[PDB]
Structure 1
Amino acid sequence: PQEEEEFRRLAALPNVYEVISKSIAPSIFGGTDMKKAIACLLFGGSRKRLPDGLTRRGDINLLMLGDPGTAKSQLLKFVEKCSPIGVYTSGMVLADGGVVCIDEFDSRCSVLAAANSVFGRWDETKGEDNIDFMPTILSRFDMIFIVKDEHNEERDVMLAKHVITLHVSALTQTQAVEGEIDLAKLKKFIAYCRVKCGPRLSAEAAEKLKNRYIIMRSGARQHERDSDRRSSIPITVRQLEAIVRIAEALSKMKLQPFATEADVEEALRLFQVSTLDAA
């Protein structure tokens, strides 16, 4: 019962999103957007039934592509550890409402998938044809992220220093950097938020997302026509549903009964940065 008050106090802060994002794998350097996406995936959306009997997915599916050594398996292991229900596979029935991590990609379950480039390493000049998955199976994933080995001398120095600092200070002290939540506390908070309530969108946010979806579809059309080539990542109504789910999850994180325009804007920004850069 006291943990209810603790969770209410934690979720009433104006900076719950930043604290949760920092709580997602503080050991791994960088990837703030990826950490935020992982957090909102862990929170997840809400499922809704209809009088006609049809059901709509209330879970988010994500796909990751990148060169080896970008710390993907570590992220999957952290997600499996943090989630109340988690399954890790090398490439469904036992998981109900949890998260299933699938490595080497080449039932109410959220799917987090990681895969490698077709040639082993990404080719920037060639552009497309670096993904072997068909567009039909690619459309199921809500967001697709691309990671490349950004070779910077100072970034390599910083990465080495961060790794060595973790190695050295790891045995000495195990403390939160800046207000990071403990693993058990974060797990219980996520479970409480998922069990308690689920929010819904508003009319103004709906209209804004409608206009943005129409503009994005027109832009994707124009890019496909000018490029004279079929994009491997099409945009359909499922993308709109995914953005709605992400906005609802963002509203769910604050336990508000009605979603706000800020959640929709953040969901649109994340969807842009992932899919449009990927496409």
Structure 2
Amino acid sequence: NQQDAQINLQAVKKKYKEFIRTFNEENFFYKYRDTLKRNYLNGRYFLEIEMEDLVGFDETLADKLNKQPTEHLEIFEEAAREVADEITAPRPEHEEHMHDIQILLSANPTNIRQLKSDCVSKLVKIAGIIVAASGISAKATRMSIQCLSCSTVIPNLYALKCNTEQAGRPKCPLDPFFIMPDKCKCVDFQTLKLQELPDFVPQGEIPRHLQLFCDRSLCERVVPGNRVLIQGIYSIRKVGKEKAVVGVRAPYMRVVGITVDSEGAGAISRYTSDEEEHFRRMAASGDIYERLSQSLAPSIFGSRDIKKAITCMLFGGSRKRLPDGLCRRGDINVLLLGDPGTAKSQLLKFVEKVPIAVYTSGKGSSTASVMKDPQTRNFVMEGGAMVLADGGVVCIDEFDKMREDDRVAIHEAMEQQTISIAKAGITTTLNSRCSVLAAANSIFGRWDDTKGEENIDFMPTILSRFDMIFIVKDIHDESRDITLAKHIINVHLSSNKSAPSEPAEGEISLSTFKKYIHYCRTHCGPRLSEAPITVRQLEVIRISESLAKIRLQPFATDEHVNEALRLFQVSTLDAAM
């Protein structure tokens, strides 16, 4: 025992354990102590702390632990397994066996463009935006071997005398150490990665980054697309002095005390009955079908009676399967078409926020990702976007102005959901409850639309599987042409229109509306009542069943709900003749 300084016991000698028992004040709740006892409500096997109680206790240890932190934390492992195991039993009647835990630390941040040898082996707060990282494989700490039969005591998370020798004379040097892993221990890993900030010249420079090391409990916690504050360690991996013209080496860090950002109102993504009153006692009003014809364009005029046909769209129809095979097309889609200038871009762009979707078109997902990664050259996939749309739907332009490769998967999803693969020798036959809104700047507008059928030069199929195709124009109406000539200076100027539609009776509140829907589309198996008009006009019946869930009713009739019929007469005049 080296009782001069750097003393090897102090912490577990008495100090930190007992400070923790000094973490003990009146209200009889001032504790970092029964924290684990509420972890033992489940056996989470970890605990949280600060770095500003030790400051509230002393000014002596905070500059001390920073030298040997990753030593202190397994010192704390020892502290715990000595302490709580005292608490596993008052008097001699309880202990099955001990176990192991982790500790979580946490104040004020830093950046990355300032940190080097000067601040090495030092614990820091910084922030970026995550990119991607690995899964979880494996680790352990100890086991033993035939050759000596001693535990594989390792400090850090070389390779040895034989000791299969003392049988009289015989030696056996040169290392016959054959590990017996059934004797072993075990830990976790992820090996993480992130990119530095988006505000600190990532443009004229390139973004630098960090490599990381997860341990026990902290994987399955973090997916990229996030923004975090963390602590780590400033360490490297190689040893030294035609690479390295003299001595060059590589950067990384560790994991310690992540604390993430959960910024406010994004996260009904990852992580009341009064609101149900708001749902229903508003739903009792029979004023929602055509009321919201001034809603989905909270800043635009037009599409009014076509917003009348969105009212059925997202609510969906019904996948009324049968005793025999089918799972027919409950899902429903739309088509729109016309020239630029009608703001149909912004119509889809602003719609992004209004359940799950993406808005890109042509040459810039698609199909599968049957490629490799870095890690022992695996081949593992990413799927399609029926993957990413199975109740979520999409709004996507430029069918025609996109590669002709990824067009067998259009009929292989809109008609049947008859999806399949053959890249490697197999049919991953995934499926999904998908639907789509379509837009285009296709050939020659209303001069083409009203008359016959020549829009796409490969198929007439695109009028069959969809129904509601209402034209986009830049019609000349001189009374409104000047308005739309000055419907574009208020848009062009002054940055005012954030929530101008908020005052409206019930044609706003994005969150409540999305939740309106995402309850509504999970009520029951609604239907209708007893009650060129050909087979795919009729196969509109989806909209018939829709008004059950639009009035949030079970049932409805044909011709009160032929509102849809009278709205479809907008489309049928395009391709009646």
SS of equivalent to 1:68: coil
Deviation at 1:130, TM superposition (A): 4.4
1:140-177 CA-partner distances (Å, limit 9, x unpaired): 11221222221122211112333333555752773335
Paired letter, 2:549: K
Residue in 1 aligned with 2:528? 201
Give the whole-Å Cα distance in 2 for the aligned partners of 1:32 and 1:260.
24
TM-score (norm 1): 0.79
Give the whole-Å Cα distance in 2 for the aligned partners of 1:193 and 1:262.
23
Residue in 2 aligned with 1:93? 387
1:43-77 CA-partner distances (Å, limit 9, x unpaired): 22121111112111111111111112222222222
SS of equivalent to 2:353: helix
1:230-279 CA-partner distances (Å, limit 9, x unpaired): xxxxx5x23211x1111222221111111134543201111222223343
Q: Structure 1 residues 20, 145: CA separation in 2 closer, same or farther (over 3 Å shift)? A: same
Identity, % of aligned positions? 69
SS of equivalent to 2:314: helix
Higher relative CO (Cα under 8 Å, sequence separation at least 6) belongs to: 1
Are the equivalent residues in 2 in contact too, given 1:62–1:144 (CA < 8 A)? Answer: yes
Q: 2:519 aligns with which of 192, 195, 213?
A: 192
Residue in 1 aligned with 2:334? 62
Are the equivalent residues in 2 in contact too, given 1:96–1:108 (CA < 8 A)? Answer: yes
Task: Tell me which moved more, 54-63 or 253-262.
Answer: 253-262
Are the equivalent residues in 2 in contact too, given 1:250–1:263 (CA < 8 A)? Answer: no
- Of structures 1 and 2, the larger Rg is shown by 2
1:178 to 2:476 alignment:
no
Residue in 2 aligned with 1:275? 572
Residue in 2 aligned with 1:209? none
Residue in 2 aligned with 1:13? 285
Residue in 1 aligned with 2:562? 265
Paired letter, 2:520: C
Residue in 1 aligned with 2:538? 240
Are the equivalent residues in 2 in contact too, given 1:197–1:255 (CA < 8 A)? Answer: no
Q: 1:148 aligns with which of 467, 473, 489?
A: 473
Give the whole-Å Cα distance in 1 for the aligned partners of 2:565 and 2:446.
26
Are the equivalent residues in 2 in contact too, given 1:61–1:111 (CA < 8 A)? Answer: yes
Gaps spanning 5+ residues in structure 2: where?
1-272, 363-385, 401-431
Q: 1:110 aligns with which of 420, 435, 438?
A: 435
Q: 1:253 aligns with which of 517, 540, 550?
A: 550
Q: Structure 1 residues 267, 166: CA separation in 2 closer, same or farther (over 3 Å shift)? A: same
Q: Structure 1 residues 79, 99: CA separation in 2 closer, same or farther (over 3 Å shift)? A: farther
TM-score (norm 2): 0.40
Gaps spanning 5+ residues in structure 1: where?
206-215, 218-234
Deviation at 1:125, TM superposition (A): 10
**Cα RMSD after superposing both structures:** 2.4
SS of equivalent to 1:118: coil
Task: Tell me which moved more, 146-155 or 259-268.
Answer: 259-268
User: Where in structure 2 are the equivalents of 1:37-52 lying within 5 Å?
Assistant: 37-52=309-324
Give the whole-Å Cα distance in 2 for the aligned partners of 1:154 and 1:52.
58
Are the equivalent residues in 1 in contact too, given 2:449–2:574 (CA < 8 A)? Answer: no
Give the whole-Å Cα distance in 1 for the aligned partners of 2:498 and 2:335.
35
1:68-118 CA-partner distances (Å, limit 9, x unpaired): 222222222233321x22233414221111111121011211111112232
Residue in 2 aligned with 1:131? 455
Paired letter, 2:567: L
Q: Structure 1 residues 46, 174: CA separation in 2 closer, same or farther (over 3 Å shift)? A: same
Give the whole-Å Cα distance in 1 for the aligned partners of 2:312 and 2:494.
30
> Structure 1 residue runs of 4+, over 6 Å off?
none
Give the whole-Å Cα distance in 2 for the aligned partners of 1:58 and 1:159.
39
Aligned length: 247
1:73 to 2:345 alignment:
yes
Say which structure is richer in helix. 1
Q: Structure 1 residues 111, 260: CA separation in 2 closer, same or farther (over 3 Å shift)? A: same
Are the equivalent residues in 2 in contact too, given 1:64–1:115 (CA < 8 A)? Answer: yes
Residue in 2 aligned with 1:53? 325
SS of equivalent to 1:270: helix
